[PDB]
Amino acid sequence: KQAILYVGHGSRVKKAQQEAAAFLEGCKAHISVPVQEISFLELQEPTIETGFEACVKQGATHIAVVPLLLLTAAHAKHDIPEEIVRVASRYPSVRISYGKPIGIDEEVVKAVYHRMKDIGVPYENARVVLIGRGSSDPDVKRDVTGIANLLQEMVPVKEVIPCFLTACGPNYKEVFSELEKDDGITTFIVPYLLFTGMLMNEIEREVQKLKAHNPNVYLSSYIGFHPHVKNAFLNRVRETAANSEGQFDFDGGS
Ligand SMILES: [Co+2]
Ligand SMILES: [Co+2]
Ligand SMILES: [Co+2]
Ligand SMILES: [Co+2]
């Protein structure tokens, strides 16, 4: 009767496809919902159309669409809802709820914490550089800053400086240029990203480049599908499925 339609962003790099698919499959066993399908916005199938239609043939009357996204931007606001409306127009009897990206959640702050500790370097009063992809949509910068504020307050770090790969400032290269110094403060670099690929690889080169000036800089792995990221995402899934007040009812918002 009830369905979950998971939507990942999709990748063309084989490794990212496998990581995202494996994560969503391991999500299925935590949700007591009889119909559950995975799908991806782009570059990777099953498509949103395919997964939605799969939900319908297994008899779903209600579909809770939950996006696997760290942050809220054009993908969350437009692309996914547009695909949802396109496929859902063909099934007006199917009720739809639409969840939020993980966004500002204490669990993701815990994921950043475990990535920092994994480096094995003392963390007290240390600087953290939180690199998000970035977007021209201000909600992205706002949410990464909110995540930075929660981490800053919860762990006795010096500060957490959000910066971005593209589209909005400060660019991580500006911070890096300001980090050529070497002041004895240990620098953790945490990529606030779900997948590896070229941008993760360029940051890797940049962390070596930065380390050439200031040896007290250490790049952690990107957060990825950390268990605490998984906890936060399952919260998103459960709240979309519960829909206890109808607040996630999907008004066709392309
Ligand atoms: Co995209
Ligand atoms: Co599990
Ligand atoms: Co459009
Ligand atoms: Co923990």
Side-chain angles (χ1 to χ4, degrees):
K1 194 173 192 171
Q2 179 68 51
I4 311 295
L5 179 60
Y6 305 96
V7 183
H9 172 289
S11 189
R12 176 183 300 86
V13 314
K14 178 136 197 197
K15 184 185 163 168
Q17 300 185 334
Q18 289 170 312
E19 287 165 356
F23 178 80
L24 289 178
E25 293 287 350
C27 282
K28 290 178 176 184
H30 297 247
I31 304 297
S32 201
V33 163
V35 180
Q36 300 188 40
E37 298 292 331
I38 310 172
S39 67
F40 301 89
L41 172 66
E42 66 179 7
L43 296 167
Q44 174 181 359
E45 57 178 46
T47 61
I48 289 165
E49 170 175 346
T50 297
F52 192 101
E53 275 184 346
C55 288
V56 178
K57 287 165 176 187
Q58 291 163 2
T61 56
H62 299 230
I63 302 184
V65 184
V66 194
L68 177 57
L69 295 166
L70 271 185
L71 303 159
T72 73
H75 279 339
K77 292 173 186 292
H78 174 109
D79 297 271
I80 296 182
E82 171 166 333
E83 265 309 319
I84 296 293
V85 169
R86 242 197 55 179
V87 60
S89 64
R90 328 207 278 249
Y91 310 98
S93 77
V94 177
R95 284 182 87 91
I96 304 166
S97 57
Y98 176 51
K100 47 182 183 190
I102 293 164
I104 313 173
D105 194 304
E106 285 194 346
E107 289 300 310
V108 304
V109 170
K110 293 183 180 166
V112 169
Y113 164 59
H114 285 219
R115 287 276 112 101
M116 290 184 339
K117 221 180 148 309
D118 282 349
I119 291 152
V121 169
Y123 54 80
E124 292 179 330
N125 193 41
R127 88 174 91 126
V128 181
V129 171
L130 188 64
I131 307 188
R133 201 201 170 270
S135 170
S136 55
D137 186 314
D139 294 2
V140 163
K141 176 175 193 236
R142 164 262 286 197
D143 287 345
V144 57
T145 301
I147 287 149
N149 291 344
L150 294 184
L151 184 66
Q152 254 169 60
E153 279 165 39
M154 288 176 76
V155 180
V157 294
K158 180 272 309 172
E159 218 71 354
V160 190
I161 168 72
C163 55
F164 308 94
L165 290 149
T166 283
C168 56
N171 191 336
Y172 81 114
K173 279 174 171 145
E174 162 178 0
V175 179
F176 278 28
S177 191
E178 209 272 321
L179 295 170
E180 293 168 2
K181 59 180 322 194
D182 175 13
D183 54 6
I185 297 112
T186 299
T187 302
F188 299 78
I189 312 198
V190 301
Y192 195 71
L193 304 166
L194 279 187
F195 308 131
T196 187
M198 83 182 286
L199 296 86
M200 171 55 189
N201 164 78
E202 187 189 322
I203 59 102
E204 278 161 64
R205 296 189 306 266
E206 290 292 326
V207 162
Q208 288 297 290
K209 287 202 276 219
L210 173 58
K211 279 213 202 191
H213 297 261
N214 179 359
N216 297 310
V217 50
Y218 299 97
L219 173 62
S220 183
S221 210
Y222 58 96
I223 55 165
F225 297 103
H226 194 275
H228 284 291
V229 169
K230 189 175 171 219
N231 295 351
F233 184 62
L234 291 175
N235 286 140
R236 289 302 175 256
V237 178
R238 293 188 193 107
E239 76 179 15
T240 307
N243 194 269
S244 64
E245 321 298 317
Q247 71 269 40
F248 302 117
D249 284 358
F250 182 71
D251 60 326
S254 328

Short mmCIF file of all heavy atoms in Angstrom, two decimals, residues 92-154:
data_model
loop_
_atom_site.label_atom_id
_atom_site.label_comp_id
_atom_site.label_asym_id
_atom_site.label_seq_id
_atom_site.Cartn_x
_atom_site.Cartn_y
_atom_site.Cartn_z
N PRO A 92 -2.81 9.79 -11.10
CA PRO A 92 -3.40 10.76 -10.17
C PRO A 92 -3.97 10.13 -8.92
O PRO A 92 -4.22 10.85 -7.94
CB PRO A 92 -4.50 11.43 -11.01
CG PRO A 92 -4.82 10.45 -12.07
CD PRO A 92 -3.54 9.74 -12.37
N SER A 93 -4.17 8.82 -8.90
CA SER A 93 -4.72 8.17 -7.72
C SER A 93 -3.65 7.82 -6.70
O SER A 93 -3.98 7.32 -5.62
CB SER A 93 -5.49 6.91 -8.12
OG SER A 93 -4.60 5.85 -8.42
N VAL A 94 -2.38 8.07 -7.00
CA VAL A 94 -1.28 7.72 -6.13
C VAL A 94 -0.96 8.98 -5.33
O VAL A 94 -0.68 10.03 -5.92
CB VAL A 94 -0.06 7.23 -6.92
CG1 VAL A 94 1.10 6.94 -5.98
CG2 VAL A 94 -0.41 5.99 -7.73
N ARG A 95 -1.01 8.88 -4.01
CA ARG A 95 -0.72 10.01 -3.14
C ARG A 95 0.78 10.11 -2.90
O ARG A 95 1.46 9.10 -2.70
CB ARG A 95 -1.51 9.88 -1.85
CG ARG A 95 -2.96 10.26 -2.14
CD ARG A 95 -3.91 10.26 -0.97
NE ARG A 95 -3.88 11.54 -0.29
CZ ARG A 95 -4.69 12.55 -0.60
NH1 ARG A 95 -5.58 12.42 -1.57
NH2 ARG A 95 -4.60 13.70 0.06
N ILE A 96 1.30 11.34 -2.93
CA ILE A 96 2.74 11.57 -2.86
C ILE A 96 3.10 12.49 -1.70
O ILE A 96 2.46 13.53 -1.50
CB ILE A 96 3.26 12.17 -4.18
CG1 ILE A 96 2.88 11.25 -5.34
CG2 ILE A 96 4.77 12.38 -4.14
CD1 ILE A 96 3.04 11.90 -6.65
N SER A 97 4.12 12.11 -0.95
CA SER A 97 4.84 12.98 -0.04
C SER A 97 6.28 13.11 -0.51
O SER A 97 6.80 12.24 -1.20
CB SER A 97 4.79 12.47 1.41
OG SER A 97 5.31 11.16 1.52
N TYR A 98 6.92 14.22 -0.14
CA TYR A 98 8.25 14.54 -0.65
C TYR A 98 9.06 15.09 0.51
O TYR A 98 8.68 16.10 1.11
CB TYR A 98 8.18 15.56 -1.79
CG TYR A 98 9.53 16.02 -2.33
CD1 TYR A 98 10.50 15.10 -2.71
CD2 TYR A 98 9.81 17.37 -2.48
CE1 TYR A 98 11.73 15.52 -3.21
CE2 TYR A 98 11.03 17.80 -2.98
CZ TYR A 98 11.98 16.87 -3.34
OH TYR A 98 13.19 17.31 -3.84
N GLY A 99 10.17 14.43 0.82
CA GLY A 99 10.95 14.76 1.99
C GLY A 99 12.00 15.81 1.71
O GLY A 99 12.16 16.32 0.61
N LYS A 100 12.71 16.16 2.77
CA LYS A 100 13.73 17.15 2.63
C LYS A 100 15.10 16.47 2.55
O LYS A 100 15.28 15.34 3.02
CB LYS A 100 13.73 18.13 3.81
CG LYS A 100 13.65 17.49 5.19
CD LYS A 100 13.59 18.52 6.33
CE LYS A 100 13.60 17.81 7.70
NZ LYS A 100 13.31 18.59 8.95
N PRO A 101 16.10 17.14 1.95
CA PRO A 101 17.48 16.66 2.09
C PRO A 101 17.88 16.66 3.56
O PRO A 101 17.22 17.25 4.42
CB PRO A 101 18.28 17.68 1.28
CG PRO A 101 17.31 18.28 0.33
CD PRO A 101 16.01 18.32 1.08
N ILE A 102 18.97 15.96 3.84
CA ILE A 102 19.44 15.83 5.23
C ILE A 102 19.63 17.21 5.86
O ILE A 102 19.11 17.49 6.95
CB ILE A 102 20.73 15.01 5.30
CG1 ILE A 102 20.47 13.56 4.90
CG2 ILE A 102 21.22 15.01 6.71
CD1 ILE A 102 21.73 12.80 4.57
N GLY A 103 20.36 18.09 5.18
CA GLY A 103 20.47 19.45 5.67
C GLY A 103 21.14 19.55 7.02
O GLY A 103 22.09 18.82 7.34
N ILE A 104 20.64 20.47 7.85
CA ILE A 104 21.23 20.76 9.15
C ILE A 104 20.70 19.73 10.15
O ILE A 104 19.56 19.83 10.62
CB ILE A 104 20.91 22.19 9.59
CG1 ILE A 104 21.19 23.17 8.45
CG2 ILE A 104 21.74 22.58 10.79
CD1 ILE A 104 20.74 24.57 8.75
N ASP A 105 21.53 18.74 10.46
CA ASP A 105 21.19 17.66 11.38
C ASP A 105 22.38 17.33 12.27
O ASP A 105 23.52 17.36 11.82
CB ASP A 105 20.75 16.41 10.58
CG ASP A 105 20.06 15.36 11.44
OD1 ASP A 105 20.65 14.92 12.45
OD2 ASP A 105 18.92 14.98 11.09
N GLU A 106 22.12 17.05 13.55
CA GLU A 106 23.21 16.78 14.49
C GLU A 106 24.00 15.55 14.08
O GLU A 106 25.21 15.46 14.32
CB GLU A 106 22.69 16.63 15.92
CG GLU A 106 22.30 17.95 16.58
CD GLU A 106 22.11 17.83 18.08
OE1 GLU A 106 22.02 16.68 18.58
OE2 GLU A 106 22.06 18.87 18.76
N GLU A 107 23.31 14.57 13.47
CA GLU A 107 23.98 13.36 13.01
C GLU A 107 25.07 13.68 12.00
O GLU A 107 26.15 13.07 12.03
CB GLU A 107 22.95 12.39 12.43
CG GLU A 107 22.04 11.77 13.46
CD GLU A 107 22.80 10.97 14.51
OE1 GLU A 107 23.64 10.13 14.11
OE2 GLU A 107 22.56 11.18 15.71
N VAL A 108 24.82 14.60 11.07
CA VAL A 108 25.86 14.90 10.09
C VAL A 108 27.04 15.58 10.78
O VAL A 108 28.20 15.40 10.37
CB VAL A 108 25.33 15.76 8.93
CG1 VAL A 108 24.16 15.08 8.29
CG2 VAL A 108 25.02 17.19 9.34
N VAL A 109 26.77 16.39 11.80
CA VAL A 109 27.85 16.95 12.61
C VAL A 109 28.67 15.83 13.25
O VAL A 109 29.90 15.89 13.29
CB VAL A 109 27.23 17.88 13.67
CG1 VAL A 109 28.26 18.30 14.70
CG2 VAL A 109 26.57 19.08 13.00
N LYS A 110 28.00 14.78 13.72
CA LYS A 110 28.72 13.63 14.27
C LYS A 110 29.55 12.93 13.20
O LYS A 110 30.64 12.43 13.48
CB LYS A 110 27.73 12.67 14.95
CG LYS A 110 27.11 13.29 16.20
CD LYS A 110 26.18 12.35 16.94
CE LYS A 110 25.60 13.04 18.17
NZ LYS A 110 24.44 12.30 18.76
N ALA A 111 29.03 12.86 11.97
CA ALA A 111 29.79 12.27 10.86
C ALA A 111 31.07 13.06 10.60
O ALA A 111 32.14 12.47 10.40
CB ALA A 111 28.93 12.22 9.60
N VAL A 112 30.98 14.39 10.63
CA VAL A 112 32.17 15.22 10.46
C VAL A 112 33.15 14.92 11.59
O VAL A 112 34.36 14.83 11.38
CB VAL A 112 31.79 16.71 10.39
CG1 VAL A 112 33.04 17.56 10.49
CG2 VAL A 112 31.05 17.00 9.11
N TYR A 113 32.62 14.80 12.82
CA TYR A 113 33.47 14.48 13.96
C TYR A 113 34.21 13.17 13.80
O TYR A 113 35.41 13.08 14.10
CB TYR A 113 32.66 14.56 15.27
CG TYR A 113 33.37 13.88 16.43
CD1 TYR A 113 34.62 14.28 16.85
CD2 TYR A 113 32.65 13.03 17.29
CE1 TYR A 113 35.24 13.68 17.93
CE2 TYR A 113 33.23 12.46 18.40
CZ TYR A 113 34.53 12.80 18.73
OH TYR A 113 35.13 12.21 19.82
N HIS A 114 33.53 12.14 13.30
CA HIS A 114 34.21 10.87 13.17
C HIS A 114 35.24 10.89 12.05
O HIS A 114 36.33 10.31 12.20
CB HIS A 114 33.21 9.76 12.88
CG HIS A 114 32.38 9.33 14.05
ND1 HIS A 114 32.06 8.02 14.28
CD2 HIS A 114 31.79 10.05 15.03
CE1 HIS A 114 31.31 7.93 15.37
NE2 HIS A 114 31.13 9.16 15.84
N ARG A 115 34.96 11.62 10.97
CA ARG A 115 35.99 11.83 9.95
C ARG A 115 37.20 12.58 10.49
O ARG A 115 38.34 12.25 10.13
CB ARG A 115 35.40 12.58 8.75
CG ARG A 115 34.46 11.79 7.82
CD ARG A 115 35.22 10.98 6.77
NE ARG A 115 35.12 9.54 6.95
CZ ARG A 115 34.30 8.77 6.24
NH1 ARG A 115 33.54 9.31 5.30
NH2 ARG A 115 34.26 7.46 6.44
N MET A 116 36.99 13.59 11.34
CA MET A 116 38.14 14.27 11.95
C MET A 116 38.96 13.33 12.82
O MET A 116 40.19 13.29 12.71
CB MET A 116 37.68 15.47 12.78
CG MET A 116 37.15 16.65 12.01
SD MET A 116 36.78 18.01 13.13
CE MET A 116 36.62 17.15 14.70
N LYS A 117 38.30 12.60 13.72
CA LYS A 117 39.05 11.74 14.63
C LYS A 117 39.80 10.65 13.87
O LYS A 117 40.88 10.22 14.29
CB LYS A 117 38.18 11.13 15.72
CG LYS A 117 38.94 11.17 17.05
CD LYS A 117 38.18 10.61 18.22
CE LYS A 117 39.16 9.97 19.20
NZ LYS A 117 40.08 9.01 18.52
N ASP A 118 39.24 10.18 12.75
CA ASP A 118 39.86 9.12 11.98
C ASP A 118 41.28 9.48 11.55
O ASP A 118 42.07 8.58 11.25
CB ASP A 118 38.99 8.76 10.77
CG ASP A 118 37.81 7.90 11.15
OD1 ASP A 118 37.79 7.40 12.30
OD2 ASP A 118 36.90 7.72 10.31
N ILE A 119 41.60 10.77 11.49
CA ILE A 119 42.94 11.18 11.08
C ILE A 119 43.95 10.79 12.16
O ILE A 119 45.11 10.49 11.85
CB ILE A 119 42.99 12.69 10.77
CG1 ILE A 119 42.21 13.02 9.50
CG2 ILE A 119 44.42 13.18 10.60
CD1 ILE A 119 41.65 14.42 9.49
N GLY A 120 43.53 10.74 13.43
CA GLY A 120 44.45 10.33 14.47
C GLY A 120 45.35 11.43 14.99
O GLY A 120 46.40 11.15 15.57
N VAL A 121 44.95 12.69 14.80
CA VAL A 121 45.68 13.88 15.24
C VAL A 121 44.90 14.64 16.30
O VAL A 121 43.66 14.71 16.23
CB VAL A 121 45.98 14.77 14.02
CG1 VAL A 121 46.49 16.14 14.43
CG2 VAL A 121 46.98 14.08 13.10
N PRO A 122 45.57 15.19 17.32
CA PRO A 122 44.85 15.94 18.37
C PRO A 122 43.98 17.03 17.76
O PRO A 122 44.40 17.80 16.90
CB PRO A 122 45.98 16.52 19.22
CG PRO A 122 47.14 15.62 19.00
CD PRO A 122 47.00 15.02 17.63
N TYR A 123 42.74 17.08 18.24
CA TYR A 123 41.69 17.96 17.77
C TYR A 123 41.35 19.16 18.64
O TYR A 123 40.60 20.03 18.18
CB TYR A 123 40.44 17.06 17.68
CG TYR A 123 40.23 16.38 19.05
CD1 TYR A 123 39.63 17.05 20.12
CD2 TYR A 123 40.75 15.11 19.30
CE1 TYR A 123 39.50 16.45 21.36
CE2 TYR A 123 40.63 14.50 20.54
CZ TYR A 123 40.00 15.17 21.57
OH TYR A 123 39.87 14.57 22.80
N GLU A 124 41.83 19.23 19.88
CA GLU A 124 41.48 20.37 20.73
C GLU A 124 41.98 21.71 20.20
O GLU A 124 43.16 21.86 19.88
CB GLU A 124 42.00 20.12 22.15
CG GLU A 124 41.25 18.99 22.83
CD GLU A 124 41.75 18.71 24.23
OE1 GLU A 124 42.95 18.93 24.50
OE2 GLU A 124 40.94 18.26 25.07
N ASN A 125 41.06 22.68 20.10
CA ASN A 125 41.40 24.02 19.59
C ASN A 125 42.08 23.96 18.22
O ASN A 125 42.99 24.73 17.92
CB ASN A 125 42.24 24.81 20.60
CG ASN A 125 42.32 26.29 20.25
OD1 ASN A 125 41.33 26.90 19.84
ND2 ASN A 125 43.49 26.88 20.42
N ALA A 126 41.64 23.03 17.38
CA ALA A 126 42.16 22.98 16.03
C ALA A 126 41.19 23.61 15.05
O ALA A 126 39.98 23.68 15.28
CB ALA A 126 42.46 21.53 15.63
N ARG A 127 41.75 24.08 13.94
CA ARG A 127 40.96 24.66 12.86
C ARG A 127 40.39 23.56 11.96
O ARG A 127 41.07 22.57 11.64
CB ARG A 127 41.91 25.64 12.15
CG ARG A 127 42.78 25.10 11.04
CD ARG A 127 43.57 26.21 10.32
NE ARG A 127 44.87 26.37 11.00
CZ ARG A 127 46.06 26.32 10.40
NH1 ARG A 127 46.14 26.09 9.09
NH2 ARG A 127 47.18 26.46 11.10
N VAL A 128 39.14 23.76 11.53
CA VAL A 128 38.47 22.90 10.56
C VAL A 128 38.05 23.69 9.33
O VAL A 128 37.47 24.77 9.45
CB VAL A 128 37.25 22.20 11.20
CG1 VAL A 128 36.58 21.28 10.19
CG2 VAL A 128 37.68 21.40 12.42
N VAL A 129 38.32 23.13 8.16
CA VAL A 129 37.93 23.72 6.89
C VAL A 129 36.89 22.79 6.29
O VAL A 129 37.20 21.66 5.89
CB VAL A 129 39.13 23.88 5.94
CG1 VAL A 129 38.66 24.29 4.55
CG2 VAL A 129 40.13 24.87 6.50
N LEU A 130 35.65 23.27 6.23
CA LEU A 130 34.51 22.48 5.79
C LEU A 130 34.23 22.87 4.35
O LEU A 130 33.77 23.99 4.08
CB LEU A 130 33.29 22.74 6.67
CG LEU A 130 31.99 21.93 6.55
CD1 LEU A 130 32.15 20.47 6.90
CD2 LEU A 130 30.90 22.56 7.41
N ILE A 131 34.52 21.97 3.42
CA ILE A 131 34.40 22.26 2.01
C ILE A 131 33.11 21.63 1.52
O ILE A 131 32.95 20.40 1.56
CB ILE A 131 35.62 21.76 1.21
CG1 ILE A 131 36.90 22.30 1.85
CG2 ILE A 131 35.53 22.21 -0.24
CD1 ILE A 131 38.14 22.03 1.03
N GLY A 132 32.18 22.46 1.06
CA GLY A 132 31.02 21.99 0.35
C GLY A 132 31.22 22.23 -1.13
O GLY A 132 32.11 22.97 -1.54
N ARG A 133 30.39 21.57 -1.94
CA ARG A 133 30.44 21.81 -3.37
C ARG A 133 30.18 23.28 -3.69
O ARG A 133 30.91 23.91 -4.46
CB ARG A 133 29.43 20.91 -4.07
CG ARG A 133 29.71 20.70 -5.52
CD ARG A 133 28.47 20.25 -6.25
NE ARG A 133 28.69 20.27 -7.69
CZ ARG A 133 28.45 21.33 -8.45
NH1 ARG A 133 27.98 22.44 -7.91
NH2 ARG A 133 28.68 21.27 -9.75
N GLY A 134 29.15 23.85 -3.08
CA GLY A 134 28.68 25.19 -3.37
C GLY A 134 27.57 25.24 -4.41
O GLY A 134 27.33 24.29 -5.16
N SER A 135 26.91 26.39 -4.46
CA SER A 135 25.78 26.64 -5.34
C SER A 135 25.48 28.14 -5.32
O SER A 135 25.76 28.82 -4.34
CB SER A 135 24.54 25.84 -4.94
OG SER A 135 23.40 26.26 -5.67
N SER A 136 24.90 28.63 -6.42
CA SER A 136 24.36 29.98 -6.45
C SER A 136 23.10 30.13 -5.60
O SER A 136 22.69 31.25 -5.31
CB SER A 136 24.05 30.41 -7.88
OG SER A 136 23.18 29.49 -8.52
N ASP A 137 22.49 29.02 -5.19
CA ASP A 137 21.31 29.06 -4.34
C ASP A 137 21.76 29.33 -2.90
O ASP A 137 22.53 28.54 -2.34
CB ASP A 137 20.53 27.75 -4.43
CG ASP A 137 19.21 27.79 -3.67
OD1 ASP A 137 19.16 28.25 -2.52
OD2 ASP A 137 18.19 27.37 -4.27
N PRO A 138 21.33 30.44 -2.29
CA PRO A 138 21.86 30.82 -0.97
C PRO A 138 21.56 29.82 0.12
O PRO A 138 22.25 29.82 1.15
CB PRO A 138 21.13 32.14 -0.67
CG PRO A 138 20.63 32.60 -1.99
CD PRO A 138 20.33 31.39 -2.78
N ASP A 139 20.54 28.98 -0.08
CA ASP A 139 20.19 27.97 0.91
C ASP A 139 21.35 27.01 1.15
O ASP A 139 21.52 26.51 2.26
CB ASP A 139 18.95 27.21 0.43
CG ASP A 139 17.72 28.09 0.39
OD1 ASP A 139 17.83 29.30 0.69
OD2 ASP A 139 16.63 27.58 0.05
N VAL A 140 22.18 26.79 0.13
CA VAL A 140 23.29 25.86 0.25
C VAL A 140 24.35 26.41 1.21
O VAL A 140 24.77 25.74 2.16
CB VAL A 140 23.90 25.58 -1.14
CG1 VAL A 140 25.29 24.96 -1.01
CG2 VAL A 140 22.99 24.68 -1.94
N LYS A 141 24.75 27.66 0.97
CA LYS A 141 25.71 28.32 1.85
C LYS A 141 25.13 28.44 3.26
O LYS A 141 25.84 28.23 4.25
CB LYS A 141 26.07 29.67 1.23
CG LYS A 141 26.98 30.58 2.00
CD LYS A 141 27.28 31.79 1.10
CE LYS A 141 28.44 32.59 1.67
NZ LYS A 141 28.24 34.02 1.94
N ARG A 142 23.85 28.77 3.36
CA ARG A 142 23.21 28.88 4.67
C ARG A 142 23.24 27.56 5.43
O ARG A 142 23.55 27.53 6.63
CB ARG A 142 21.78 29.40 4.48
CG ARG A 142 20.86 29.22 5.66
CD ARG A 142 20.07 27.98 5.36
NE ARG A 142 19.06 28.19 4.33
CZ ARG A 142 18.03 27.38 4.13
NH1 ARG A 142 17.90 26.27 4.85
NH2 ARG A 142 17.15 27.65 3.18
N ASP A 143 22.95 26.44 4.75
CA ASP A 143 22.90 25.16 5.45
C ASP A 143 24.28 24.66 5.84
O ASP A 143 24.46 24.12 6.94
CB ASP A 143 22.23 24.08 4.58
CG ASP A 143 20.73 24.27 4.44
OD1 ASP A 143 20.15 25.03 5.22
OD2 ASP A 143 20.14 23.62 3.55
N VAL A 144 25.27 24.85 4.97
CA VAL A 144 26.63 24.46 5.35
C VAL A 144 27.12 25.31 6.51
O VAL A 144 27.81 24.82 7.41
CB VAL A 144 27.58 24.50 4.14
CG1 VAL A 144 27.58 25.85 3.54
CG2 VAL A 144 28.98 24.11 4.57
N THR A 145 26.80 26.61 6.51
CA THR A 145 27.15 27.46 7.65
C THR A 145 26.44 27.00 8.92
O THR A 145 27.04 27.02 10.01
CB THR A 145 26.80 28.91 7.34
OG1 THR A 145 27.53 29.33 6.17
CG2 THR A 145 27.17 29.81 8.50
N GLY A 146 25.18 26.60 8.83
CA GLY A 146 24.48 26.09 10.00
C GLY A 146 25.13 24.82 10.53
O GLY A 146 25.27 24.64 11.75
N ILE A 147 25.55 23.94 9.62
CA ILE A 147 26.24 22.71 10.01
C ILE A 147 27.56 23.04 10.67
O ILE A 147 27.95 22.45 11.69
CB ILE A 147 26.46 21.83 8.76
CG1 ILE A 147 25.16 21.20 8.26
CG2 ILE A 147 27.48 20.75 9.04
CD1 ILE A 147 25.14 20.99 6.75
N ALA A 148 28.27 24.02 10.11
CA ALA A 148 29.52 24.50 10.68
C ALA A 148 29.30 25.05 12.08
O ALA A 148 30.11 24.80 12.98
CB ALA A 148 30.15 25.56 9.78
N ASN A 149 28.22 25.80 12.29
CA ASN A 149 27.95 26.37 13.61
C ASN A 149 27.67 25.28 14.63
O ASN A 149 28.19 25.32 15.75
CB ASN A 149 26.73 27.29 13.55
CG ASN A 149 26.97 28.55 12.76
OD1 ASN A 149 28.11 28.91 12.48
ND2 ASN A 149 25.89 29.23 12.38
N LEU A 150 26.89 24.26 14.25
CA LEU A 150 26.62 23.18 15.19
C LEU A 150 27.89 22.41 15.55
O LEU A 150 28.16 22.16 16.74
CB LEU A 150 25.59 22.23 14.58
CG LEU A 150 24.21 22.86 14.39
CD1 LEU A 150 23.20 21.83 13.86
CD2 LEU A 150 23.72 23.55 15.66
N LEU A 151 28.72 22.09 14.56
CA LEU A 151 30.00 21.45 14.86
C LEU A 151 30.91 22.32 15.71
O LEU A 151 31.52 21.84 16.68
CB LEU A 151 30.73 21.03 13.59
CG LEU A 151 32.00 20.30 14.06
CD1 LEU A 151 31.69 19.00 14.79
CD2 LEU A 151 33.02 20.05 12.97
N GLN A 152 30.99 23.61 15.38
CA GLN A 152 31.81 24.54 16.15
C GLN A 152 31.43 24.56 17.61
O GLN A 152 32.29 24.57 18.49
CB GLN A 152 31.58 25.93 15.57
CG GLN A 152 32.64 26.57 14.73
CD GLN A 152 32.09 27.82 14.06
OE1 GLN A 152 31.66 28.76 14.73
NE2 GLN A 152 32.07 27.82 12.74
N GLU A 153 30.13 24.58 17.89
CA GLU A 153 29.67 24.61 19.27
C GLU A 153 29.81 23.26 19.97
O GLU A 153 30.01 23.23 21.19
CB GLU A 153 28.34 25.35 19.34
CG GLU A 153 28.88 26.82 19.35
CD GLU A 153 27.92 27.94 19.06
OE1 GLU A 153 26.76 27.89 19.52
OE2 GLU A 153 28.35 28.88 18.35
N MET A 154 29.73 22.14 19.25
CA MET A 154 29.67 20.85 19.93
C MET A 154 31.04 20.25 20.20
O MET A 154 31.16 19.41 21.10
CB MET A 154 28.87 19.82 19.13
CG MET A 154 27.38 20.03 19.08
SD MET A 154 26.62 18.81 17.99
CE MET A 154 26.68 17.35 19.04
#
